[PDB]
DNA sequence: TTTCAATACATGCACAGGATGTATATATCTGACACGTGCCTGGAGACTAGGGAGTAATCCCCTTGGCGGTTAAAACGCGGGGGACAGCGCGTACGTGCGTTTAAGCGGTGCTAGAGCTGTCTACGACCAATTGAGCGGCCTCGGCACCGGGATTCTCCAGGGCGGCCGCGTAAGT
DNA sequence: ACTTACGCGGCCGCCCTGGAGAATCCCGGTGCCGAGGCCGCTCAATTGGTCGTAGACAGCTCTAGCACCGCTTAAACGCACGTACGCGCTGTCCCCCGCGTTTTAACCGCCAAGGGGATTACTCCCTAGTCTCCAGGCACGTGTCAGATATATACATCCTGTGCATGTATTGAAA
């Protein structure tokens, strides 16, 4: 079953707070939808690889090591997990 | 000549009559001419806009600008 | 009453958010979104909280970087309010397309 | 003196590093002097990072070191920022910076 | 019983106490330090193996490690590291 | 005589240079520059022509990429003529400059 | 002996042709000097590593393999030389 | 020869020797080089097809690096795979800006 | 004297003649092809070794190679490659 | 001699036509690099002994997914007004285009010796093994540190009252 | 009886004093996280043998490198002017800021069981060794695609000639 009506979770105040943190004073209109889309794209770009690692591990639960490896292969090493 | 300070409208009329062009004397050139030929200050120079507005509303100065863009002003005779 | 000019509370909130390190995106919507996206590859899968936290942190960092680059492009473009064209130019110069 | 760490005057282990180098499928013949250089450089870098973190912690009126201090020490220094340019630190944040054109006048 | 795991916390604690006698550490910082140590491990090992494969040799000695350290690090930090290796190695050779 | 407007020969030369693959930078000045820079690290060294050709090709490719990014930034900046600020912004977004 | 008066080899027509190839219509003034400087910087950023490889090869002539390795380590793999 | 048994043109013994010598693993199977050589031959045949198409479009009998550069920069898959790679003696794609055209 | 060197030109020539019977190649293109083959060699070997080290195993079989191919390549090209491996491998298994 | 429109007439504006300097195959020819052939050999191939990594069946309890009552802060919808986004006349000075004259890029030739490159001798240092044992790792613990919360304080930003430049508001003395 | 002595008159721009709310500096009593004690058992330690990779001496000849003579062509000095960059100034509509209101988030209490994780036997698949032959290592000579090119050739772009709508003057028609 494919789920829908879930991309709208990233509401307006969330992107507004993100822009406040990034240093933006005013926001337009199409940015919300565009950024959201790009976010989903990046999500896929990680999750696909994660699932592949799962298929290489002969398991059904995606552990943190697979996500760490997928993020490190893309050139974005993220610490704080230690393995 | 340049003795006492005349009215702003008279100075603007003199600056318009001093310049000659087919499209009209631009407002910036008029302001520069008044600033270079008079002893007026910054706040007194700021009165040129309102004086030109009053002269155009009265009918002494004709406007031939582009959809109200402060292009140029001419003297009606 | 008392009226405020635009930009008074904005700078204060910006200085506020530049001091704390807590999460801004809620965990349940992000988890549901991850579970939705995971169904497009293989059905019947399970996840942990550590993976969700890692994905959320990576997404927040990437979005902060993209917004910083967009703000820099908007400042260079003789403007203040950012536009989607700035984001497009940022992702074009980055090479991600 | 039985352990090589005491003979070389270091705190990091030498036998463990040698075993990892011989078991990591890097080379069939590994020397017995390279782990000394390796552990020495590791201890030097770790001591420098800990010095910077302790300086940040003492400047922030905090007795213990948090990842925020590490993030600040990495993003404020030039060498650590150049070495860790493609690395993201979790629970670190960004540097307090305000644009000049956004200030009122 | 629990499976045995390895970590690098005692050495970091000893170094911190040798530097700052009154300073602690948390768990996330310990994980960051462990990940950084593993990253340096992998990077230096890969550089050494690549140099050994390029030089058509089959033995990783000291000169290859020194060259890898001087290549991966910019400049001054590299020199300092070289000294930190050299002195300790001399102390080892006299032992 | 005959006068030409600015931009007539420019487009033709741009279309010309986008068809050939020969080198534009001369070999002797580049070789002398490489020999000068090499003396800042260690004296008494020798080089080959292959290394000089590789360095020249890499430098030309990097300069072409930087000029393309600068032209894109200048077009986005509602202008035509490129400026050093565009190069600075390009190298800042690329991450090569601090 | 340190050599000088050699950075001026990249003359105005060279940068003009480079801008024509890149797609630039008009050039300013300080770009020539700035680009030249950056070029020299990149040159050093390669040549240093090359010399280091030479010092690791116990030779006096910088071969093409050292330059290829130095360019590949920087993330800019250059083919056409098969070695 | 195993290349004739598997029906391929790339050698299998040489690839197996390189995999066993390259210090990758102590125990290497005897089926992996078949997959490897098959994928290599497929990719090489596709690249050669694209290069021959470019050469026939350019009225040239032989393939030059310009044809390879054009086939790589025009295709999406080869450009995404070779995004950080620079091709010597290749050049750029003929592109003209829209705002620079006279009106 | 001389020294014996290795190259990958006969196989490329055979593939080109099987595709385009009337098409040649130069020396720079041959060097480019050799460098590309070496790059693919190193990339796939490193991916296989990394997967073997991650899975805590000590034998590089077929599933690890297939996973490395499907990970390094995007999608469709990966699938095609998998088929190119599978069919030829079946033909090998029915041989020996 | 004056009341009103035609028209007669001089400015910017849309369209068809002409001159000239540059992109573009088209028969030719000559020169070097693409391509088929030959011979020696060290890497590729066939047959057989060995053991330990690898495949698969079984048992335990750790932990991811479900759900229910509950308090409230963050999510959601409408008002109005200051200034930010967008369209426009204009000023001079900085780049291209094409003049012309001096220079150093480029090509053919000759000679040399520094050190890259190949072959050989062998001994210091490294791989592998049996026995020992002490440094490194997992579960209890409680205690000294910071997380959460009520109150007084000095810092920074938005809005309000008074004054100067003079112009008509309209009077008395000059021509 | 009307103009300039300015008598006063009343409306826009710059300053510092003025109030209220948000950021900022000090205890209070509680909690769970850093840190010290404890004890188990596998990997680091000591030392003898045998072996093959690396340190070192020597003969080639090759490619790195220095001096030279013209040759056209790329680099360089310098007159002119037009279009792009830049400053100034007006309008309107959009996203900033405050307030009524509703819904879904985190902490929580508790019930299930699945595929994460430790134990073992035995076996088919990989390693090691001697023997042996044809794919592929590279010297060689020649010969066919395309490098250089002179004479027509059709196309792109700046320059210049020509059709057309509006304000205003002068001879005719009207007061």
Numbering used by the authors:
A (entry chain F), G (entry chain B): 20 to 102
B (entry chain K): 1 to 77
C (entry chain E): 38 to 134
D (entry chain C): 14 to 118
E (entry chain D): 27 to 121
F (entry chain A): 38 to 135
H (entry chain G): 16 to 118
I (entry chain H): 27 to 122
Lines quoted from the article behind this entry:
The nucleosome used in this study was reconstituted using the Widom 601 DNA sequence with 15 bp DNA extensions at both ends with bound linker histone to obtain a 177 bp chromatosome (details). The overall resolution of the density maps after 3D refinement was estimated at 4.5 Å. The local resolution map shows that the linker histone region exhibits a significantly lower resolution compared to the core histones indicating variability/flexibility of the bound linker histone or even its lower occupancy. The electron density corresponding to the H1 linker histone was found to be centred at the dyad axis. We noted a strong density in the minor groove of DNA at the dyad indicative of H1 interaction with the DNA minor groove at dyad. Furthermore, the EM density map had a more pronounced density along one of the linker arms compared to the other arm, indicating an interaction of the linker histone in that region. Additionally, the extra density along one of the linker arms suggests that the H1 interacts more distinctly in that region. Therefore, this model is neither a strict symmetric nor an asymmetric model of linker histone binding to the nucleosome but reveals an on-dyad binding with H1 tilted towards one-linker DNA arm. Based on these results we propose a structure of the human 177 bp chromatosome wherein the linker histone binds at the dyad axis of the nucleosome, in which it tends to interact with one of the linker arms in a tilted manner. Compared to the 177 bp nucleosome, the chromatosome displays less flexible linker DNA arms. In addition, the unwinding of the DNA is less pronounced in the chromatosome due to the linker DNA association with the bound linker histone, in agreement with the observation made in the Cryo-EM study of the 197 bp chromatosome.
